Amino acid sequence: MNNERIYQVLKGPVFSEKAQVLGDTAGVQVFKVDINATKLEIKKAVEKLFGVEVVKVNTTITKGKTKRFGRTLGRRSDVKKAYVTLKAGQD
Amino acid sequence: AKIKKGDQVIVIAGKEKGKQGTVLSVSEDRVKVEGLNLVKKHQKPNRVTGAEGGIVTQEASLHISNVAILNATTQKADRVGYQVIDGVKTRVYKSTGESVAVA
Amino acid sequence: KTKDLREKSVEELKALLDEQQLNQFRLRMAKATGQLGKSHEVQVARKTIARIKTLLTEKQ
Amino acid sequence: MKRTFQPSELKRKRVHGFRARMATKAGRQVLARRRAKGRHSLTV
Amino acid sequence: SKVCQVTGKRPVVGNNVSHANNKTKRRFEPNLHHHRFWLESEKRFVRLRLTTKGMRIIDKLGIEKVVADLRAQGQKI
RNA sequence: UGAGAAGCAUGCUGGAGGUAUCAGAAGUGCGAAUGCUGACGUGAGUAACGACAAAACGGGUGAAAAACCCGUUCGCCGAAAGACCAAGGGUUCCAGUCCAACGUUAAUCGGGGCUGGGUGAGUCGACCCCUAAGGCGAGGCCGAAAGGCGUAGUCGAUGGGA
RNA sequence: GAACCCACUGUCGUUGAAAAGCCAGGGGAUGACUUGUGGAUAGGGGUGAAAGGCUAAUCAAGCCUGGUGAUAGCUGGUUCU
RNA sequence: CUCCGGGGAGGCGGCAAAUAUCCUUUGAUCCGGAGAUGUCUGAAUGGGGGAACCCACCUACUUUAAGGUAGGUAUUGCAACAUGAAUACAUAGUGUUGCAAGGCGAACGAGGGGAAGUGAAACAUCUCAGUACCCUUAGGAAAAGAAAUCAAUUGAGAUUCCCUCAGUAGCGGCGAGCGAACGGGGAUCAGCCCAUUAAGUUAUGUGUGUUUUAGUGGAACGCUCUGGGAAGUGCGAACGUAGAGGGUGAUAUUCCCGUACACGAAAGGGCACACAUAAUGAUGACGAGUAGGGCGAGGCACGUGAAACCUUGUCUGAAUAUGGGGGGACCAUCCUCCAAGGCUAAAUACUCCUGACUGACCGAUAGUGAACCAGUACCGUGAGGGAAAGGCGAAAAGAACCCCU
């Protein structure tokens, strides 16, 4: 795989109550990822760019909301979230 | 012809006609001169930035055509022209032809 | 930076491209974490990557 | 009481769909008229 | 299509005119039929869709010349 | 002021255009066409506030409580007024905050406004393999043109396949 | 005789809860039965156990656009002195 | 994003104003020219498909796990090559390579098909009308074009368009209606070829002129009065190859942008002409299923009428310069021309677009449906139908603070 795509697979971490509880109690990291990323791609990117070993990856897609600002109607973009479970105690 | 940011000018039109000052900024066709065209602005308090609201005095922009370059020698309103001296294009006074004062 | 990049060879340009892409990812991580105060760095990195790509295409 | 419109997406797109319009000469003319008039939505 | 290969004749449009001068649209069609002709140069039968005028032209000029002319025109036979 | 269509002067309002005379050209005078567009009357504070079971009291919050929250009683459905799937809808889902508009009354409440959050698959479904009705269809047959039918084939679940 | 499919009588409603309904009775209910999904038939045409019935709340010839500003010896209207 | 040229104090696009970072005289923003990158659908072309989706194969470099990268894989037509039935040579068929086409878009051209309302005070001949509409296809224009043509004082000389001739001569249920030509005056002006191969056209390359894609300089007003504000009053002054237009707190040749004028191009593009090659004209060498005729239709202003002339669906069918076509039934004389093979510019038709300029055209119920986030909201299964909505103030200086709630 190309490092160019490796460096773009991961967008940013997720901060929320569910993510905090999961990280604290099970060592699961929640990431915002590219809409077109695969589980294997995310696994490889996490291992390469964080020096940790991944056991399993779970993914889900949430559709963007339709908002009304003034008289204009718009839609936000879809988001993909990855749950990555690490081995034993890591990170 | 151009009135530059740091020039000294004299107001020829409006309620401030007959007063001189230093330009602070030029944008579009509006220029602000230090200590001229003041307004009383009523400012509402802002929670995030504090700075309890109060009455504040600040300069209001004037149309560019209402001010003119001030000539040091005669202390009189004048007009600006362009002349190529040596290898540099330079501003001059149309009244005397001397190069515009640099400040 | 364009003049400095021009003198470099293809190998050096490609190595710097990889380094800058890694730096861009790290800057994104930092901004997501919210620990970075200055934001012009991301734009600098993106434009540097574009410049390196243009120079590589020109040379090759 | 049952009314005229009983929706079904598969039938709707199989009858009035983009490829259905492209499949025939008259449908292509319908698309041309809608493009000339400037419709934001050409087909269902 | 009802097109003669030798002469290019095709159905044309005209009028039925009645005794009271009522007019109606009509078509005049050619006397078109399929015919097999022997060709010695190629040692085979060639099937052509043509008219009786085309048959007269073939009788006048010979099968070889007409076939050559059609091939030159672009017909595949 | 004049016989009329109308003219003239001036108080108030308004804040930047107007135009004599003589010629010239017209989208040149509205009460009606069950005329067209918008605004507003009368009926009149009149009719009505939409199944099948019904409500009562104490406390809480609040500017305001018959309708919200907690509690004690009463009544109603219980082969549908319960639980679920496909189709269809698309955020209506959860939490915080607000009551101008909506909710056939009020509203602290809401499927209403604003901010955030939420869907996790080798075993569930789709995709995928296979075909029915039928669609399209290289060549091919036919037809003024457009085109029609159809072979090999290729699609097509409402069915078969861990 | 229930579910399911129908619509024979009467009351109510007729600016309705409803542009065809409710309530009390009524008929079929293993069959020429009922029903889901997906297909075929297109306007002088289709389909019809046949009422000129149905063909998107429209049918003795659907709807939309064009000929088109059709024609009307008919009715109405036609503005200052 | 890169490079070239312009320019010199600001700038980080708008609804939509703000703070914050920020970039800039080692030259930013911005303007002109040339390059780099350019996801998916859509003729869509690797197969499929409910457009923006699903699935697959081959080659080459990397790779160690189940990947990446760069390409290629549609159909039809033509050409070369290879392979190859019934069938013995063959032929059909099959395959590889190379080239070309498909689609979209305003009007104008050309061609294939082709109505009805209406008028005739009914209506069928006729009219509407070769109009509306469907289909095929080219160019910057198309088409036509150089006499087997007109004329008749025995003359004129290829096509195309305008004014006359003339509402004339004629056609017509001789109704309603339709409606020429000869001759004259203008616009433009041009002829050249059939296999010893012409004019003309197209693509590439070179040179001489010309015009465009940013830009630079550019004259000359003071006092006084009313006023919130002067460009308005009164007094005098200056420039003018410049007193066009717009703006500035009310009406400005001398306040700003400009105006006449002068000047300007690194790079790229258009046009005229000269020259060097490619193709083209061009499967064509004097015109036989031809001209003419019988039958049924269509077109010519002309409805079969005394119907001359052109096209042909069908049946026939010559002479060939000692020859043949036309001059309005037809015969003789006379006059005129040479069909059955081609190419060709200008005058002519139009505007989706580009730059400049104009209006006894409209000024928010007007003018485009649309001055405003409009072919949107909204209605309908769908083709389709289709609105309303401009104005604070010169400058936000857009009301600090107090009171009722």
DSSP string, E8-23: ----EEEEEE-TT--E
Distance D20 CA to F153 C1' (A): 22
Q: Which residue from A31, A47, A41 is spatially nearest to A86, judged by alpha carbons?
A: A47
Question: How many domains does the structure of chain D reveal?
Answer: 1
Q: Is C23 helix (H, G, I), strand (E, B) or coil?
A: helix
Determine the distance from the C-alpha atom of residue A44 to the mean position of all C-alpha atoms in its chain, rounded to a whole number: 13
Tell me the sheet residues that pair with A10. A33
Q: Which residue has the tokens 């509880």?
A: A21
Judged by CB atoms closer than 8 Å, whether chains meet at A13 and C33 is answered as yes
Is residue A87 within 8 A of residue A53, CB to CB? The reply is yes
Q: Which residues of A touch C (CB under 8 A)?
A: 3-4, 7-8, 10-13, 49
Q: How far apart are CA E77 and CA E74, in angstroms?
A: 9
Looking at residue D16, its amino acid is H
Is residue E56 within 8 A of residue E35, CB to CB? The reply is no
Q: How far apart are CA D39 and CA D41, in angstroms?
A: 5
Q: Is E57 helix (H, G, I), strand (E, B) or coil?
A: helix
Q: Determine whether E54 is exposed, middle or buried from the number of CB atoms within 10 Å of its CB (0-12, 13-18, 19+).
A: buried
Bases in strand G with any atom closer than 7 Å to a protein CB: 20-21, 37-39, 56-57
Q: Which residue has the tokens 């419109």?
A: D5
Instruction: Calculate helix-pair angle for C40-59, C10-33, nearest 10 degrees.
Output: 160
Is residue B91 within 8 A of residue B100, CB to CB? The reply is yes
Q: Is B24 helix (H, G, I), strand (E, B) or coil?
A: strand
Q: Determine whether E67 is exposed, middle or buried from the number of CB atoms within 10 Å of its CB (0-12, 13-18, 19+).
A: buried
Q: Which residue from C53, C29, C51 is spatially nearest to C42, judged by alpha carbons?
A: C29
Is residue A85 within 8 A of residue A46, CB to CB? The reply is no
Query: Looking at the partner chain, which of C21, C32, C33 has a beta carbon nearest the beta carbon of A7?
Result: C21
Judged by CB atoms closer than 8 Å, whether chains meet at A7 and C25 is answered as yes
Q: How far apart are CA B69 and CA B72, in angstroms?
A: 10
Token pair listed for B26: 């030029």
Q: Which residue has the tokens 């079904």?
A: D8
Helices (DSSP H) in chain D: which residue ranges? 9-16, 18-22, 25-37
* E61 Cβ contact list (under 8 Å, min separation 6): none
Looking at residue E72, its amino acid is A
Token pair listed for B85: 């001296």
Question: How many domains does the structure of chain E reveal?
Answer: 1
Looking at residue D11, its amino acid is K
End-to-end CA distance of chain E: 17
Interface probe, candidates A1, A2, A3, A7, chain C, greatest C C-beta count within 10 A: A7
Q: How far apart are CA B12 and CA B9, in angstroms?
A: 9
Q: Which residue from B55, B56, B64 is spatially nearest to B33, judged by alpha carbons?
A: B64
Q: Is B90 helix (H, G, I), strand (E, B) or coil?
A: strand
Q: How far apart are CA B31 and CA B23, in angstroms?
A: 7
Interface residue C33 vs chain A (CB under 8 A): yes
Q: How many CB atoms lie within 10 A of CB E4?
A: 19
The nucleotide closest to B55 (CA, C1' atoms): H400
Q: From chain A, pick out residues whose CB is under 8 angstroms from the CB of C56.
A: none
Token pair listed for E48: 């052509």
Cα radius of gyration rounded to whole Å, chain B:
17
Q: Which residue has the tokens 């560019």?
A: B64
From A2, which residue of chain C is nearest by alpha-carbon distance?
C18
Following DSSP, what letter does each residue of chain A receive, concatenated? --HHHHHHHEEEE--SHHHHHHHHHH-EEEEEE-TT--HHHHHHHHHHHH---EEEEEEEEEPPPEEEETTEEEEPPPEEEEEEEESSS--
Interface residue C24 vs chain A (CB under 8 A): yes
Residues with CB under 7 A from strand F: A 14-19, 22, 28, 58-60, 62-63, 65-68, 81, 83, 85; D 7-10, 25; E 1-2, 10-11, 29
Domain carrying residue E16: 1-77
Helices (DSSP H) in B36-92: which residue ranges? none
Q: Which residue from A52, B10, A36 is spatially nearest to A44, judged by alpha carbons?
A: A52
Is residue E69 within 8 A of residue E25, CB to CB? The reply is no
Q: How many CB atoms lie within 10 A of CB B33?
A: 25
Query: Which DSSP letter does residue B14 get?
Result: S
Domain carrying residue D39: 1-44
Token pair listed for B84: 């190529």
Q: How far apart are CA C43 and CA C31, in angstroms?
A: 12
